[PDB]
Amino acid sequence: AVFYKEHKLRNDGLVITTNQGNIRLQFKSEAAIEVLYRADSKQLPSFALAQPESAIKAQLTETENHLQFSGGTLTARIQKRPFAISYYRDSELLLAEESGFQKINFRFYLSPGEKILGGGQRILGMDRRGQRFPLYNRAHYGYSDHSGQMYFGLPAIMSSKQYILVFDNSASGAMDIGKTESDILQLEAKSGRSAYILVAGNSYPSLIENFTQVTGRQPLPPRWALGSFASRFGYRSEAETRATVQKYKTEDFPLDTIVLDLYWFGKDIKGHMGNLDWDKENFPTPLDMMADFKQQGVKTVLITEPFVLTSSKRWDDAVKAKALAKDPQGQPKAFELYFGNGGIIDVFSKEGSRWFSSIYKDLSKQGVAGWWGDLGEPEMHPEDTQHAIGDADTVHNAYGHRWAEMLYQQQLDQFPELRPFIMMRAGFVGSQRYGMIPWTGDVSRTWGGLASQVELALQMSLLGFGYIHSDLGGFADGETLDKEMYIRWLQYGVFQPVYRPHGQDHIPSEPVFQDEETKAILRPLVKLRYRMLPYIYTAAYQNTLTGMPLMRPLFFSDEKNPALIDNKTSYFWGDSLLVTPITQAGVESVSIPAPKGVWFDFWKDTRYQTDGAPLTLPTDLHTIPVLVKAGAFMPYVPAVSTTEDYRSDSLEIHYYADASVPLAQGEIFEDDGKDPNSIKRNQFDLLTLQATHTDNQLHFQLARTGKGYRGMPERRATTLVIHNASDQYQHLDINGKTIAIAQADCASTPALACYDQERRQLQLVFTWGREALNLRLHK
Numbered sequence: 001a002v003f004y005k006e007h008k009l010r011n012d013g014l015v016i017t018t019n020q021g022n023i024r025l026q027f028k029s030e031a032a033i034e035v036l037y038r039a040d041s042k043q044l045p046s047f048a049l050a051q052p053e054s055a056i057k058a059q060l061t062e063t064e065n066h067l068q069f070s071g072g073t074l075t076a077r078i079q080k081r082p083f084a085i086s087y088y089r090d091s092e093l094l095l096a097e098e099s100g101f102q103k104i105n106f107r108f109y110l111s112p113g114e115k116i117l118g119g120g121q122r123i124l125g126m127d128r129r130g131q132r133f134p135l136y137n138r139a140h141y142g143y144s145d146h147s148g149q150m151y152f153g154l155p156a157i158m159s160s161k162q163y164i165l166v167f168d169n170s171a172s173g174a175m176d177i178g179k180t181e182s183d184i185l186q187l188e189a190k191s192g193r194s195a196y197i198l199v200a201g202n203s204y205p206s207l208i209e210n211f212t213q214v215t216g217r218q219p220l221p222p223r224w225a226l227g228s229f230a231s232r233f234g235y236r237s238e239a240e241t242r243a244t245v246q247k248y249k250t251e252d253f254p255l256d257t258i259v260l261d262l263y264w265f266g267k268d269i270k271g272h273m274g275n276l277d278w279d280k281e282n283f284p285t286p287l288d289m290m291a292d293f294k295q296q297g298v299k300t301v302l303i304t305e306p307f308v309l310t311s312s313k314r315w316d317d318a319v320k321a322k323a324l325a326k327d328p329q330g331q332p333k334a335f336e337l338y339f340g341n342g343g344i345i346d347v348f349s350k351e352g353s354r355w356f357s358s359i360y361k362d363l364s365k366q367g368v369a370g371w372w373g374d375l376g377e378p379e380m381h382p383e384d385t386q387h388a389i390g391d392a393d394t395v396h397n398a399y400g401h402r403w404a405e406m407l408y409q410q411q412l413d414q415f416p417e418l419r420p421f422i423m424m425r426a427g428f429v430g431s432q433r434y435g436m437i438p439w440t441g442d443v444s445r446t447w448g449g450l451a452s453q454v455e456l457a458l459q460m461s462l463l464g465f466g467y468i469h470s471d472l473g474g475f476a477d478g479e480t481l482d483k484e485m486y487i488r489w490l491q492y493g494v495f496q497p498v499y500r501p502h503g504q505d506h507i508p509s510e511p512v513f514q515d516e517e518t519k520a521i522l523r524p525l526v527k528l529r530y531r532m533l534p535y536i537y538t539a540a541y542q543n544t545l546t547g548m549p550l551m552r553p554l555f556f557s558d559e560k561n562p563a564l565i566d567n568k569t570s571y572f573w574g575d576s577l578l579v580t581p582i583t584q585a586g587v588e589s590v591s592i593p594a595p596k597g598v599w600f601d602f603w604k605d606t607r608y609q610t611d612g613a614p615l616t617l618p619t620d621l622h623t624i625p626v627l628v629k630a631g632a633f634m635p636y637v638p639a640v641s642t643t644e645d646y647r648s649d650s651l652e653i654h655y656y657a658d659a660s661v662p663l664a665q666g667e668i669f670e671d672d673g674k675d676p677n678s679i680k681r682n683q684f685d686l687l688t689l690q691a692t693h694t695d696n697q698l699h700f701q702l703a704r705t706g707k708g709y710r711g712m713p714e715r716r717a718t719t720l721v722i723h724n725a726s727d728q729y730q731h732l733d734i735n736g737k738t739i740a741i742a743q744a745d746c747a748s749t750p751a752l753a754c755y756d757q758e759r760r761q762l763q764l765v766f767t768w769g770r771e772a773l774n775l776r777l778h779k
């Protein structure tokens with residue numbers, strides 16, 4: 001039995017007293033509220049919130065039976081007797097407490113028909129209603145087509161009613177999404193903070209904008225993060241690492257970054273972890289290695305882990321520095337891991353953080369450009385391990401999150417003019433604000449492992465992680481390459497956030513070590529990835545601005561059709577491309593549930609119109625099915641080997657014209673690819689294109705804003721290819737000057753405007769300078 005007794009309003013927050021204790025309510029924005037039960041008691045702070053101490057002005061009104069506490073769009077309605085809080089957007093019920101709060105336990109009602117995404121990485125179906133699962137980050141080695149518990153859980157859900165609910169608790173716990181009781185959402189933890197956060201929105205984009213506003217926005221990664229990575233588990237030597245960089249050159253595959261797994265610090269998988277320094281028998285001249293790679297535009301990333309083994313060179317020093325978590329007796333805690341016997345660096349302590357940070361600083365000074373943190377669940381984390389702020393079970397799901405924060409802060413302190421690259425396997429809600437780029441762990445080399453990746457990506461993307469990706473080609477076990485699976489996985493790779501093939505080294509993960517057929521297929525696609533950098537990097541910019549994920553689910557296309565929520569086989573890559581990965585062997589055709597409208601075959605230019613019915617496309621081995629939305633501007637630059645050579649002096653833009661799209665817009669974001677302050681300081685060149693398409697005219701308005709950046713081209717040579725262009729356009733005006741449109745020999749003359757009747761493509765070639773440009777095509 002819980003009932004209201006009294007309330008006070010202090011520092012814009014509502015403090016309610018019930019018979020059971022105090023509850024603190026603070027609006028973190030107009031659309032988001034933090035509800036803290038046991039507010040009078042000492043407890044761990046928020047991990048989810050970017051500004052945990054903010055509380056914006058709200059209005060409180062009181063009635064006989066209720067209080068209402070209201071920000072601009074979200075309202076909390078507090079029923080006095082019995083005590084229960086419910087949440088409204090406008091006049092619409094989002095979520096109501098059932099018994100609410102009662103070791104730690106929250107119970108809410110679910111509405112009939114309500115669909116619930118969430119929980120982070122699980123392979124259960126996109127709608128997790130009907131499922132129960134733990135909140136305890138944990139390895140799932142070799143997973144394929146099913147998982148209730150893996151590396152990176154999130155204590156959060158997204159509802160078809162367009163709210164996001166976060167359980168802001170770091171402890172070992174559980175989520176029961178109407179499994180045990182069909183109309184009850186239950187959140188449980190053994191200990192930790194007794195708080196939740198509700199975020200509302202008017203659309204899925206806005207919801208995500210509102211969520212990332214209070215949990216954190218990902219800073220723009222360095223543009224090289226969008227390039228080709230060489231990786232395996234693991235390069236065994238400097239000579240082998242150099243030979244791999246060389247293989248990319250001699251095989252003509254793009255390469256930005258080479259990744260070094262655990263052999264960089266010892267010759268065996270076991271026994272060396274914690275050395276955190278070069279194994280000189282196998283990496284004899286590592287400074288030269290990294291410098292030599294830098295001359296070829298290639299970055300070096302090194303693996304690190306939380307654990308320091310008692311067999312490692314740094315055990316005695318870690319103990320001396322008090323860097324390791326302790327037992328209740330106060331000695332360093334040691335325990336068995338896969339890798340051997342050892343302790344865990346206490347990233348929650350001053351001592352642990354300074355010690356680990358110093359090691360990162362030193363290696364970064366030597367030439368390391370980015371960082372890979374593996375095993376941050378932490379993979380093994382015995383219950384009686386004590387960290388500075390609590391025991392293992394209490395802090396477990398935030399260890400990785402704090403590890404990212406530590407490393408992020410460290411990298412910014414060392415290199416304030418560079419964007420940190422931090423790739424980790426486990427985090428918390430908000431970890432994206434520390435630049436965390438997650439990957440979906442040790443996936444099996446099976447079709448099932450591939451077939452799960454869109455589900456996993458969308459689930460993480462929706463709740464803050466735009467750069468979620470997979471080990472391309474698969475990671476775990478296998479005895480010989482499954483060639484078709486590998487090709488499909490690396491094709492899909494082009495259209496997902498990070499291009500990082502990676503696997504256990506008994507089978508090659510890198511595309512340069514594949515057979516002639518496989519390379520003939522993948523080489524033009526890895527180059528396509530580079531040619532498409534302006535499209536991808538523009539989506540990255542939008543992710544930084546608004547949280548908008550790079551991969552978007554099919555359900556964004558129609559928010560009034562909740563059945564689309566179940567789709568985990570077709571997704572949007574940026575605004576304009578609907579991608580359907582092939583995820584089983586021998587598939588001869590696919591049925592693509594394209595939204596109502598006009599669509600083009602990305603590869604073949606075929607125009608399709610549909611009023612709802614799916615489109616059936618044949619498959620081939622050299623592509624996966626990709627449709628372009630009518631009204632898309634697809635921007636390309638010439639392929640380079642490394643993003644260090646990126647230029648946009650030459651632009652090629654493809655516009656997909658159709659009379660059904662009378663107004664279309666596109667943008668291309670350009671900056672120096674490296675300055676972490678480029679967006680804040682307007683040191684960029686934002687190119688905008690607008691098409692106006694009427695019965696007798698097609699008009700393009702081109703412009704640039706922003707303050708520019710060093711090396712920005714003043715004038716770009718631009719080729720605009722208009723697909724599905726009318727054969728009736730007779731003239732072009734460029735800023736009022738009339739130019740005839742040639743109707744022959746478009747590929748064989750230096751034509752300024754030419755219509756190719758066989759391809760229905762109208763090509764315009766012009767100089768795009770700093771002033772506004774209008775191109776008018778007239779029948």
Ligand SMILES: *[C@H]1[C@H](O)[C@@H](O)[C@H](O)[C@@H](CO)[C@@H]1NCCCCCCCCN=[N+]=N
Nearest residue numbers: 232233261262303374375425441442477
């Ligand atoms: C962490 C990370 O997820 C991977 O991408 C890394 O490459 C590795 C190595 O640093 C790490 N996971 C290691 C898993 C090792 C298990 C090896 C088992 C051998 C086969 N046994 N069976 N069955």
